[PDB]
Amino acid sequence: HAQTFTAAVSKTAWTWLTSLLGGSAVIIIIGLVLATIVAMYVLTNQK
Amino acid sequence: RMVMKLESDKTFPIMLEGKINGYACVVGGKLFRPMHVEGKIDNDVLAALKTKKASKYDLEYADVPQNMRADTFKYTHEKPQGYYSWHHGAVQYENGRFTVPKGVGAKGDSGRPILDNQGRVVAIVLGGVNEGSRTALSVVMWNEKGVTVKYTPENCEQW
Amino acid sequence: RMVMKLESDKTFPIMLEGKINGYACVVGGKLFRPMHVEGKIDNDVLAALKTKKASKYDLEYADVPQNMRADTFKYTHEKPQGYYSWHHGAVQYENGRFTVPKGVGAKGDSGRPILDNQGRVVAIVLGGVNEGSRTALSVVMWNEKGVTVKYTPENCEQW
Amino acid sequence: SICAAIATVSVAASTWLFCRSRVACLTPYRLTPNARIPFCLAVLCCA
Numbered sequence: 140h141a142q143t144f145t146a147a148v149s150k151t152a153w154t155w156l157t158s159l160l161g162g163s164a165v166i167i168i169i170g171l172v173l174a175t176i177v178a179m180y181v182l183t184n185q186k
Numbered sequence: 187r188m189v190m191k192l193e194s195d196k197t198f199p200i201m202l203e204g205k206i207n208g209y210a211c212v213v214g215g216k217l218f219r220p221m222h223v224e225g226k227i228d229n230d231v232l233a234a235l236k237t238k239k240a241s242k243y244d245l246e247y248a249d250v251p252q253n254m255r256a257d258t259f260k261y262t263h264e265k266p267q268g269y270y271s272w273h274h275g276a277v278q279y280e281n282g283r284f285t286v287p288k289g290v291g292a293k294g295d296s297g298r299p300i301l302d303n304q305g306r307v308v309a310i311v312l313g314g315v316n317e318g319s320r321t322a323l324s325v326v327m328w329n330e331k332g333v334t335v336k337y338t339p340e341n342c343e344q345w
Numbered sequence: 346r347m348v349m350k351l352e353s354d355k356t357f358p359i360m361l362e363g364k365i366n367g368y369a370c371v372v373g374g375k376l377f378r379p380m381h382v383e384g385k386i387d388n389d390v391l392a393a394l395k396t397k398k399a400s401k402y403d404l405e406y407a408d409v410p411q412n413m414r415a416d417t418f419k420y421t422h423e424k425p426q427g428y429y430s431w432h433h434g435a436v437q438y439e440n441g442r443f444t445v446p447k448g449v450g451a452k453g454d455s456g457r458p459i460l461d462n463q464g465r466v467v468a469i470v471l472g473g474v475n476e477g478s479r480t481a482l483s484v485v486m487w488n489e490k491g492v493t494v495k496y497t498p499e500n501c502e503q504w
Numbered sequence: 505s506i507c508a509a510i511a512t513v514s515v516a517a518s519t520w521l522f523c524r525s526r527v528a529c530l531t532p533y534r535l536t537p538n539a540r541i542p543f544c545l546a547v548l549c550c551a
Contacts, residue, residue: 159507163514170521177525181532185335214537240531247535252499256477260440261537331543332536440538 191271191301196257198232200225200297208345209297213259213307217248220297220312222344243326243336244312259299259307263330270308271301277323282337284311285320296345300325315343351430351464355418356457357391359384367504368456372418372466376407379471381455381503402485402495403471418458421467422489429467430460436482442496443468443482450480455504459484474501526550 148156200208200223208223210232217232221244227233237248250258270277274290277300284300291314299307309327316322317339324338356368361384369378369386376391380403385392396407409417428435433449436459443459450473458466468486475481476498483503485495530550533541544550 156507159511163511166518167514170518170525174521174525177529181528184329184331184333184532216535216537216539218535240535242528243531243535245535253475253477256444256479328536332538332540333532334535335532 188271188276191305192273194259194301196259197299198227198229201228202226205294207294211259211297211299211307211310212250212254213299213310214261215250215255215258217250218245218297218310219248220244221246222312223296243334245310245326261328262302262304262306262308263328263332265308265327269303271303271305273298278320283339284309284323284325285317286314286323288316288319288321290314290321291323291345293345313342313344315339315341348430348435349432351460353418355416357387359386359456361385365453366455367453368458370418370456370458370466370469371409371413372458372469373420374409374414374417376409377404377456377469379404379456381471402493404469404485418460419465420487421461421465422487422491424467424486425461430462430464432457437479442498443470443484444476445473445480445482447478447480450482450504452504470504471495472497472501472504474498 196212198210198212199206200210200219202225207225208220210217210219210227212218212232217235217237219227219237221239221241231251231254232248235248235250237246239246265279267279270279270284272286274295275287277284277286279285291311296312298311300309300311302308309325311323311325314321314323322339324336324342326334326336329335356370358365359367359369359378359382361382366384367379367382369376369382369391371377371391376386376394376396378386378396380398380400390410391407394407394409396405398405424438424441426438428437429443430436431445433454434446437444450470454473455471457470459468459470461467468484470482470484472483473480474483481498481501483495483497483501485493488494529544529548530541533544541551
């Protein structure tokens, strides 16, 4: 046969990699959404 | 008439190398000092107080002791259009802006509370930019719900 | 002169050690006195009257006999801004807070009732904290819904 | 090592934006002389 780059990566390894890379992006998105909401709220409550 | 609004000893100067560069004012049981003004308050008990900064609103606030809470300015959440009293002279509020005659407010004329016709603070001025005859002012006021909105003219000039 | 002429004999000192330590007041058919004062009420009928304890609100109350409900203080639920009558002097209600001038009020003054200009009790005090030239008071009042909100300032010196 | 570094950077950045949002949502209400903050604490319990 021939060896592919991702040939030997198991499902468990894939889930762990997605949790580490893919969960951190989720946390970043949550933080960005919270920051945008807070900024919009404070800006709209000035006037 | 106008002299009956300058007998407020509750304000405190800021000393820097023996010179005056700003005023720290106590309102509603909290001491507000402009952040950009460097120096030390003359009063020892207020100088010893540790203050928490506020970069966005450009002033640092501290909690005054219990014994000093009695003699303190009173803030107002309503700002009717028209006349207002200040130490330098008369001020006028129009369309959400404070305006004063030209040359009013200069080096070391920030942190001064702006008094109302009743005799209680409505806002604190931190700087002003000249606009023709009437100089506009950058000033932090208080909303009806208590959000401490700040109104600042474009290209504001410090003090 | 006029602030002290509003004199009512319904208030009753509490006796122990043979000295004044506080006053218990009959309002609206209930006799109120704090935890702080120990001893017996001067009125023997009320002295022998059993009391129910409310530790969290710092006052125990007793149900007066049906005959004595005719002559008692009348409670108040609205608190207009400004000065109020009292045993000692005018008491200023400002910013939802009862305040008295310097020196007024000390140990043994707890339990006295604060009334209004009409001549009816608006609240009853339990202690006072010196805030400076103006002294704040720990006091319980009456609301429109009858929830009896009590106001206890920070680190109050407990009368 | 790359995954751990990315995760740590993401967590630190999310914490930084959360703290900045809390400051920007509280200071307009915090520096009021009487310090009345019912609304923000009721809607999000920031403190």
